[PDB]
Paper text:
GapR is an essential NAP in Caulobacter crescentus involved in DNA replication, chromosome segregation and cell division. In this paper we present three crystal structures of GapR from C. crescentus, crystallised in the presence of double-stranded DNA with a sequence from the origin of chromosome replication. In all three structures, GapR adopts the same overall tetramer ring form as seen by Guo et al., albeit with small but important increases in the diameter of the central channel. DNA could not be visualized in any of our three structures, but DNA could be detected in gel electrophoresis, indicating that DNA is present in the crystals.
The same crystallization condition also produced crystals with a second morphology, which were of the space group P2221. The diffraction from these crystals displayed severe anisotropy and had resolution limits between 2.0 and 2.7 Å. In this crystal, GapR is a dimer in the asymmetric unit, with the tetramer again being formed by crystallographic symmetry. The tetramer could be overlaid onto the I4132 tetramer with a root-mean-square deviation (rmsd) of 1.5 Å. The main difference between GapR in the three crystal forms arises from slight changes in the orientation of helix three, which results in minor variations in the size of the central channel.
Numbering used by the authors:
A (entry chain B), C (entry chain B): 11 to 89
B (entry chain A), D (entry chain A): 11 to 87
Write the structure that this text describes.
């Protein structure tokens, strides 16, 4: 079971994690606000999110996969 | 081709978003460090994560939902 | 690149996968219908889905995890 | 405690759902077997899955969206 010490520790784990989860939500909300402003100024949010997605990935692997993709699409007449 | 105005604003958007994402990554890292510390003290990280998930809903509705679960589980043997 | 043979193969992969994905959607829709009927007859859908969830998991691991869970919850006064 | 009526219907619901789930599992297995076969013939399963995902949307809007992407990617260098 959990003793006085372990009980105290457990409480701290939950409280610490919960505080951080709140901060994570604040950041997530701020990111949503940025996209909201961008949409208001005429930018395509979906495309913006893909730009951020692409920039996260390794360039070498991204360019290689995009190459194989174009091959398959044109093979079945899609690009 | 986007003009200088749209170009300059596009860069600021991506730069800003990417900044928040790193800030979010830091927070996610801190959450891992707590669970990693807990695991070191003999805690079950998987169970801990569920407790946090459980605590998102109030205790009343929690036990009410679980009462129906046991009612169903006992009914089907 | 893709030759005549590989091009023919690729087309078959996409068509075969796409047909199966359609069937997967039919099943998923049928599952939704069952829950719709259950809800109509007074059953809590959320609880039902958890019953199916529990029954999928290994009983030994499930019972062990549920045991550790009750320990932690009562330690911080939640159960 | 649920009565005989609610009990009997509860069992049928879970039994039915669980049956559909296995049927769904079979279909998911068949999809894996195709990709496993494709990989054997030298295809890239990850790319194949994207093609199926791409084909869900029509070619017109596809290339329209990608045109904006390149416009944005070139603007930010």
């Amino acid at each position: 079971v959990l003793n006085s010490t372990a009980q105290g520790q457990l409480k701290s784990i939950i409280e610490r994690v919960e505080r951080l989860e709140v901060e994570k939500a604040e950041i997530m909300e701020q990111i949503k606000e940025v996209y909201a402003e961008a949409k208001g100024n005429g930018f395509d949010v979906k495309v913006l999110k893909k730009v951020v997605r692409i920039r996260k990935q390794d360039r070498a692997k991204r360019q290689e996969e995009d190459a194989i993709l174009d091959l398959y699409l044109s093979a079945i007449g899609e690009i």
